[PDB]
């Protein structure tokens, strides 16, 4: 049964990576682990965990009950094929091979699922099997197997409208596009926030709301922010339940820059704590800083540097080493003066920077077909 | 390193240098391969007791570096010290140039022998008819019938 199954892997993260944080995760992970027949997924989580020396009877009672479910599948198959329904063996393990998917590993899942895929002639079970493959490929981050059943799913979204199987799917493309650092696609898959539902994997709808605002504040510009997230009632009333996030969004839009750092270290700190964000929190706020520098600094031309400490966020030499590392980083289009204490900006035309990415991609694909040209013909 | 003492202006250290140009002409052969070519300086100099051995080893070092005509001309003017041996992998090198330039000159001399004929350097035909006598004396005449055509004589 894979419907509560994501919290398990999130708590494997929460057990493993925060090294100080190693008590309650091995409490509640055990609470869900040595019940509900979980047998395979914790031997190396036991390696990361302690010895837990007497696990042997705990193993044997649960592989014993697993043996009971296995042997009653083995009691089901012959009366199933004896008087036949819709091939009631695979009609049994199209319900209980998902039990074997949670309990056993991915193999007893996958050969039974690619097995049972050829039975149900309508997509109403096929696409749910594909959803199960999406979820376990999400668990073991099967980054090539998700690319298969995404398209193999999408091939079955045509016939019918199936918007509880299409808008539902857009959640999966959004979570994979936020697993990878694809933010402008991630908020775009997080466009709706209406047909999105009280799901199994974000049991708080508001956690999904926090995710789509965290990606949207990078992914879109002011025109969109000043129409979409500011006037959405369905997005507004759920952040109305949030004291910090409602402040965190409106500090940027309402030009409240100094408290924006205060809330920013909170959101970045929780994002540092967060599973499936934790790969890219260091990429997030380094973009948030230079974006906030763009928003304030593209208003004036003759703004001094000593205004930004008290007006923007404290620390003059911090603004010095920060801004430089960004002009030096080839973004943040201005040119700071030092020994008269002023910051001067410019405007760049969309002809050199638009050229720059073209020489990047052109040299990249030239390296690509260069390499494959070396590959073929020995 | 022995190339450094080519500024002595005493006609015995040139001879002491060309003592060391025939046996160690494979390791720092690479060293004096292109760097110093003062063979023709002492070779065209009034300083004798050298100009005899030097065009030999110039005909060694300029050979492998594609200067087949340079080693051919210094092969001609090198002297009795040059053709004294035919017991190496080098007589094969010098006859494949000298008989070649000989007979391909002698096709033009087969056109116009009257006037502008060859200034033979006294072995340019001497090893032609000499190595020809080697072909006569080595009992082979299915080849001695052949080069006798090839000389255009």
């Amino acid at each position: 049964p894979k419907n509560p199954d994501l919290r398990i892997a999130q708590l494997r993260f929460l057990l493993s990576l925060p090294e100080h944080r190693g008590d309650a995760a091995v409490r509640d992970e055990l609470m869900a682990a040595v019940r509900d027949n979980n047998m395979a997924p914790y031997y190396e989580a036991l390696c990361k965990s302690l010895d837990w020396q007497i696990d042997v009877d705990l193993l044997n009672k649960m592989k014993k009950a697993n043996e009971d479910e296995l042997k009653r599948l083995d009691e089901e198959l012959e009366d199933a094929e004896k008087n036949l329904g819709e091939s009631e063996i695979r009609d049994a393990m199209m319900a209980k091979a998902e039990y074997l998917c949670r309990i056993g590993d991915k193999e007893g899942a996958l050969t039974a699922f690619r097995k049972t895929y050829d039975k149900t002639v309508a997509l109403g079970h096929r696409l749910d099997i594909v959803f199960y493959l999406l979820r376990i490929g999400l668990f073991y981050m099967d980054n090539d197997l998700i690319t298969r059943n995404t398209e193999k799913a999408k091939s079955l979204i045509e016939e019918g409208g199936d918007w509880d199987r299409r808008n539902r799917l857009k959640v999966y493309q959004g979570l994979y596009c936020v697993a990878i650092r694809d933010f402008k696609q991630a908020a775009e898959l997080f466009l709706d926030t209406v047909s999105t539902f009280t799901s199994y994997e974000l049991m708080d709808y508001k956690t999904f709301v926090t995710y789509t605002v965290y990606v949207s504040m990078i992914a879109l510009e002011r025109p969109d922010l000043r129409e979409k997230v500011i006037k959405g009632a369905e997005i507004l009333e759920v952040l109305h339940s949030l004291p910090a996030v409602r402040q965190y969004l409106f500090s940027l839009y309402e030009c409240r820059y100094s408290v924006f750092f205060q809330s920013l270290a909170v959101v970045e700190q929780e994002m540092k704590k967060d599973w499936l964000f934790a790969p890219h929190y260091r990429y997030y706020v380094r973009e948030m800083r230079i974006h906030a520098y763009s928003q304030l600094l593209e208003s004036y031309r003759s703004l001094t540097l000593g205004y930004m400490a008290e007006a923007f966020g404290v620390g003059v030499e911090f603004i010095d080493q920060e801004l430089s590392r960004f002009i030096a980083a080839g973004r943040l289009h201005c040119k700071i003066d030092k020994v008269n204490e002023i910051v001067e900006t410019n405007r760049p035309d969309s002809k050199n920077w638009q050229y720059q990415e073209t020489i990047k991609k052109g040299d990249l694909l030239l390296n690509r077909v260069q390499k494959l040209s070396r590959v073929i013909n020995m | 390193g022995i190339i450094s003492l080519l500024d002595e202006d005493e006609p015995q250290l040139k001879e002491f240098a060309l003592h060391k140009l025939n046996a160690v002409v494979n390791d720092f052969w690479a060293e004096i391969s292109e760097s110093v070519d003062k063979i023709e300086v002492l070779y065209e100099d009034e300083g004798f007791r050298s100009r005899q051995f030097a065009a030999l080893v110039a005909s060694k070092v300029f050979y492998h570096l594609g200067a087949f005509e340079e080693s051919l001309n210094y092969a001609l003017g090198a002297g009795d010290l040059f053709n004294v041996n035919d017991n190496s992998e080098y007589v094969e090198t010098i006859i494949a140039k000298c008989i070649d330039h000989y007979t391909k000159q002698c096709v033009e001399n087969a056109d116009l022998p009257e006037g502008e004929k060859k200034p033979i350097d006294q072995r340019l035909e001497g090893i032609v008819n000499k190595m020809f006598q080697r072909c006569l004396d080595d009992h082979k005449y299915k080849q001695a019938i052949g080069i006798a055509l090839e000389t255009r004589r």
């Binding site: 309508a122 | 494949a96 080595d138 082979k140 052949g146």
Partner: protein
């Protein structure tokens, strides 16, 4: 001197033989494909002057390499076959190609269409499944 002089001519020349011959072998086939394209292109103006081929409909075959073929607009004909066509391969109710001057049996086109597939195509029942059944499980 004929060993180290004369034999060295042979080891040299063969290297020019081995790659100039190879360049020749590439080059003449490189002609040859284009030549076949040229004469194949010229042949079509003569070949397109030929008359067309009739389509027919085999009812059923009979004795001595013959069949019974009825064109849609015209009448049934007893014709023979060509030598490259098998009787068991000739199925009843199958279309053919047919030459026109002697009505010799030419080829065997597609498979027409089963009179029932046309029928259900006309009727167009709304195809269904168990997954669109609303609460009729005891009747199932």
């Amino acid at each position: 001197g004929l060993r180290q002089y004369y034999l060295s001519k042979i080891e040299e020349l063969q290297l020019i033989v081995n790659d100039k011959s190879q360049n020749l072998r590439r080059l003449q086939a490189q002609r040859n494909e284009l030549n076949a394209k040229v004469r194949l292109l010229r042949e079509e103006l003569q070949l397109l002057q030929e008359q067309g081929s009739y389509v027919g409909e085999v009812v059923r075959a009979m004795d001595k390499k013959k069949v019974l073929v009825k064109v849609h607009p015209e009448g049934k004909f007893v014709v023979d076959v060509d030598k490259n066509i098998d009787i068991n391969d000739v199925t009843p109710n199958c279309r053919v190609a047919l030459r026109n001057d002697s009505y010799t049996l030419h080829k065997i086109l597609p498979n027409k269409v089963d009179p029932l597939v046309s029928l259900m195509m006309v009727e167009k029942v709304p195809d269904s499944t168990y997954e669109m059944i609303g609460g009729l499980d005891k009747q199932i």
